[model samples]
Target: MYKQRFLELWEELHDPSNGYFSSHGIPYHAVETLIVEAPDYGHLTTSEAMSYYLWLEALYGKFTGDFSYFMKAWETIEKYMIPDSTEQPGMSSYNPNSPATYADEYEDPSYYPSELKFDTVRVGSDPVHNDLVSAYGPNMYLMHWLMDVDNWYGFGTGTRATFINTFQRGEQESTWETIPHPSIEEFKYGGPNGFLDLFTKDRSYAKQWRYTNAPDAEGRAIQATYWANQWAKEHGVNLSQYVKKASRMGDFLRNDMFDKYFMKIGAQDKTPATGYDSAHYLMAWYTAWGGGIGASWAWKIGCSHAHAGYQNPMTAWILANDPEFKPESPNGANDWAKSLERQLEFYQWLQSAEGGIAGGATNSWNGRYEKYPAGTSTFYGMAYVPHPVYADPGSNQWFGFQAWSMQRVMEYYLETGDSSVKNLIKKWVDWVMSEIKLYDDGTFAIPSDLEWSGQPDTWTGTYTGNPNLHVRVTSYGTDLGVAGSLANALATYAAATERWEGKLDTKARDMAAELLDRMWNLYRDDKGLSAPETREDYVRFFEQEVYVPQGWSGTMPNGDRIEPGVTFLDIRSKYLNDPDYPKLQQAYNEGKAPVFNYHRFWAQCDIAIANGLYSILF
Candidate 1:
C-alpha cells in the first residue's frame, strides 16, 4: 500500500500541465502561483525545491531499479541551480585575505543600505579557500539559494532558471519585506546599482553576482543519495561516479563552518586546528559569495549564526564513515568525523526540557559581537538566538522546522543505533507524538506554532537534561507538510528501534502510517496532495510595506513603479493578474482571510519520500 501510494503521488507530481515543475522540468516552489511564503512566488524555485526533487527522483530509482531519473535530476540541478561561469566569473579573482568587507547588520529593513565598514572593521581571512578550491574546482559546487524558473523577472538571461536572492539585508528582512534581485547584476530594476545600494552601502556599486548556500538543503540531497546508493548496490548497479560527486559536494559544504567573523566561539574544541580559529563545524544559517568577473574583486562569507534546525549529523556521519561517500580531501573525512561529534553535542545542548530542540547560537552577538543579549544562554562563545535567522515570523516558531531537524537526527540514529542518539530520538518522538492528533475520518492536526522559553545550560561535554529549557505548542493546524515531515521522522525512529532492539515500535509505526496514508486517502487531488491553508498573511498584500529609502526610486522589469512606502502589491503588480488573485482580492474586500489549496513541491515530495521509506523498511 505504501509503495503504491509513492508511485501514485509520483505520477500525479509528474503530470505536465499543472505539475510541480516548470516547463524546463525544474521543480517550482508550488504548482499554484500567487505565493507569499519563503520563495514569494510559486513559479520561483529554491535550492530546497531542487534538493527535494532530487530526493523524489532518487527514491523513484530505488523502487524501479532504473537510475536514469535519479541521474537526470542531478544533471538538472547542476545545469539550472548552480550559477555557471558567466554568472560568477569573479571566483578566480577572489582573495582569501579579505573574504568579505564588513557591513553592520541592523534589526529592520528601514535601516538598510547598510554601510560597508571597510574602514577598520577587521574582516577575517577565508581560512578554507584553499580547501574549498582544491577539493572541488575553481568554481563553487554549491547551489544558489533561489532561482527564477520562468524568467518572470524579465532579465532575459537566456537560461531556463535565473539565479536570484531575496533575504539579504538582515534577520528582520522577511520575504514580504524584500526586493527580489537577479543573480546577474544587470541594473535592470530599482535605483542605480540595481538592488545593491538598497542592502549594502558603498561609495560605488559594481556589476557583480552572488549566491548563498543553505547547507541543510545540500545535506538532504546527500541523505537521499545515501539511500539511492544502498538500494542500487542491492540491484547490481555501480554508481561510483555519482557517489564521488556527492562527496565533492560535501567538501564544498564544509565552507559552512567558518565563523561569520573570525571571532572565537564559546566552546573551545579543536576549532583552532587550522590557522583560522573560527571553524565550529556545527551547521550554520548560510555561507555566501558575491562578485563577478566583470569586476576584479569578490568576497566570501560564512554565517555567524548556527541554527539547531539546520544541523545534519546524518550527512556528517555519512561523509566520515561511508567509504564510498567519504570526501576525497585529505582532511575532509577527519573534519566530518569531528563534525559528526560536534553536531551531536549541539543537539544535546539545545534539547529542551520537553525534548523539543531550542534555537541556535551565533559567534557574533547582534551580528557584530557588539550587543550581546546580556545574561542569555550560551552554547560556548556563541550566544543563543531563539529565532535565529529571521524574526518576521520567528524562524523557529514554525513546528515544521522541528520535524525537518528531527528527521535528520532520526536518520543518523537509524544508521548507527548509537545509544546516545537513541535516547534523544525516543524522548523527542514521545514529545512530538503527544502533541499530534489523528482521526478516523483522516483529519489530523499537528503543532503549527511552537513557543520556546528559557535556555539550555552551557555545555561541559557530557549529556544532562536541560532542566530550564522548555517548549510549548502554542497552536496547531492541518499543515500537510509538517505532518509528512513528522511522519518521516517518526517512521524512521520506528524502524531504528526495531532494527536495534528486535521489536517493532508499532505505536509510532501506526501513527506514522496514518499521517501519510490517511492524508492521501482524504486529500488526494488531481495534482499533488493539498488542503486549504488560511492565508491570514495575504492581507499583508496591502498592509505590509515593501520599504524603499526615501527619495530612492526605480522600476521593476515589468514597469511596475518601485517608490517609497509602497505595499508588497505595489511593486509586483503582476500578481494581480494571477488566476488565484481573485480569491485573495475577495477575501481582502470582505475583511476575511483567503483560503487556497497550495500543492507545494517540497511538501508533496516529503509525503512521497516518507511513504517509500516505510514500505522498504517495514
Candidate 2:
C-alpha cells in the first residue's frame, strides 16, 4: 500500500521544473536546513519528528474536529516506518534460548567493526519470543527508528523513501559522527564487506536486515494516538483501529524493558538471563532485530542502557490501564502493568537532590558490560551513569529531555491523579522553574546545558533521598525546543494540581503559561515561532572530521566517496548543493558566525502543542 503510494508521492515531490528536491538530492535541516545540530542537514528527517507530525494531526482533530489527517499520519508511519513482512523473514528461526551473539561495543568511531563473540558471553533466554510471535504471527510490530524520506543517500533500491540507520558505534558516538546505513545490510553502502564492517566485525558478513526502535518516540506516538482517539470519539468519530494498532505496537514495545544482551539487570557476571527475569521494566535505550539474507537465521537484542529521558510512564499507564489500548499478547497487559510501577520508581530512584532527575543507569557497565569500579550506586543492580547514550554533549545535558520525560510523568499523573509522581513533579518544576528566566523585554532563557555529579543510592524497594546524586545548571540560553516542552509540562502539571490535592497550583500554572506566552509574543514570524540561533556548531561542519575508519573506504549510493580523511562534508558532498551551504560556509570562509532563525517543524509544532495543551488544560 505505502510502496505504491510512496512511489506516487516521490514523483510529485521530484517533478523536475517545480519540485521540492530541485536537483538537490538530499535535504539539509530546512532550505537553510543546513541546521547543524542533528542529521547535520535540513533535508534529513528523523523518527523523532514523525511524532511531531502525529501531534499536529491529533491537535488538528482536537481543535477543529477533523481526523482524516490524523489517520493519515498513522498510515504513513505503518506503511513506510515499520519493517515490512519481507523484512521479517527469519522470525520463525529467532531463538529465544540464545537470542544474539555478543558484539563488543567500542567507545569511538575508530573502533572499526566490533567483533562478535560467538560463544563467550552467554545471553539469557528471550521470554517474549513465543509471546510476540503468537500474538502477531511472523510480523514484527515496531517502527524502524530512522528513515531517508527522499532517499538522497541512495541506500535504497531506487530513488524513494527507505529505512536507514546510524549511531551504532558506542555511547560516545554522537549523531554528527554517525554514518547512516540502510536497515537492510546487503553489502550495499559501506566498505568492502558492506556497512557491517563499519559497525560489527565478523569473519564474513552476511546480507541481513535490522531495525532499531527508539521507545521514547514510540511512546510519544501512542501518546498522540490516545488523544486522537479520545478527542475523535468525543465528537462521534471512532479511531479505535489506530488505537489497537498502537496496542500491538505497545506489545512489541515491551522489548524495550529487557536488557540488551539479556545479562543480569544489576551487577554483571555472565549469568545468562533466566526467564523474563532480565527485564528492566524501565525503558531501555533500543530494541533491535536482524536476520541473514534468506531468513535462515535471525537475532533480536535489547539495549542495556535506560535513559531517564526515554522513560514514559504515560504510555506505560496507557497500555496497562486502558482496555482499548491493551496488547492482546498473553502477558502483554500484565507486563505493562508492571512497567507502569517500575517506570515511576525509576524516576524516584534517579531524581537528583536538586529535583532534576539525573541520567539513566545501565546494566551493561559500559555498553559491553565489562567489570565496573569497586563500589557504585546501583538501581536494582544496574549502575548509574550521569549520561546514558551519546556522551559528547552529555545525553542528559539537554534540558529538552528532562522536560520531555517529565511531561510524560505529569500526563500520567493528570490522568490517574497518581500520587507516586506528585513529589517528583513538585520538585522538578520547582528546580526547572528556578532555572527559567523571563526578562522584562519579553526575551527569556531556559537552561541549555547541565552538569551532573554524584550518584543515587541503591534501590532497595524503599524511598530514600540521594543527596549525592546532583545536577547543576551549567549554562542558560534560548532553546525553543526545550522551552516548548517545559511549558507543556508546566501547563499540564498546573492543570493536574487543580483537581488533585484539592486546590489549584497557580504558581506552576502561571509560569508555564507565561513562558509559552512570552515566546510567541516576541518571536512569532510568518513561518512559525522561531528565535535567532547562532551556529557556532556549524564550525564543525566546516572542519570537524567525521571519524571514518583508517583503512575502510566505500561510496555513498550517490557516488560520494567515503574514504579515510573524509570530513563529514567530504563523504556527503551533495551538502554543497544545499541552498544554505554558503551562508553556513561563511564561518570557515570568514570568521563571521551566522545566526539563523530556523523554524524547525518539530520545535514549532512543540510550541503549538504546548499552547494547545494550555487552552484545554486550564
Ten contiguous residues minimizing lDDT sum, candidate 1: 267-276
* Residue 472 accuracy (lDDT) in model 1: 90
Displacement of the residue 50 alpha carbon in candidate 2, Å: 1.7
lDDT, candidate 2, 1-618, per-residue tens: 212222232233234432233232321134344666656556666667677767766877876687887787788777777877866787778777888887776676677567778887777888887888877785778877677777778887665777777777776666667787888878766668778887777887678888888888789898898888889888888887889888888888988899887776775666787887888898988889878787488888888888999999989988888888978876888899999898888898888888989988888776767776876888778888888878877888888988899899988888888886677788888898777777878888889889888888888976577878778887878888788898888888878888787888888878876787677678766555577877676677767677888777888887877877767788778888877777777666888777788756567667767767777744
Q: How close is candidate 1 to the true structure, as a TM-score?
A: 0.96
Query: In lDDT terms, which candidate is top?
Result: 1
User: Each model's TM-score, in the order given?
Assistant: 0.96, 0.93
RMSD after Cα superposition, model 1: 2.2
* Per-residue lDDT of 195 in model 1: 82
lDDT of 1 at 331: 80
Model 2 CA deviation exceeding 4 Å by range: 1-31
Best by TM-score: 1
Runs with alpha carbons beyond 4 Å of true place in candidate 1: 157-159, 267-276
Q: What's the lDDT for all of these models?
A: 0.80, 0.77
Q: Candidate 2 has what TM-score?
A: 0.93
lDDT of 2: 0.77
Candidate 1 C-alpha error for residue 80, in Å: 1.0
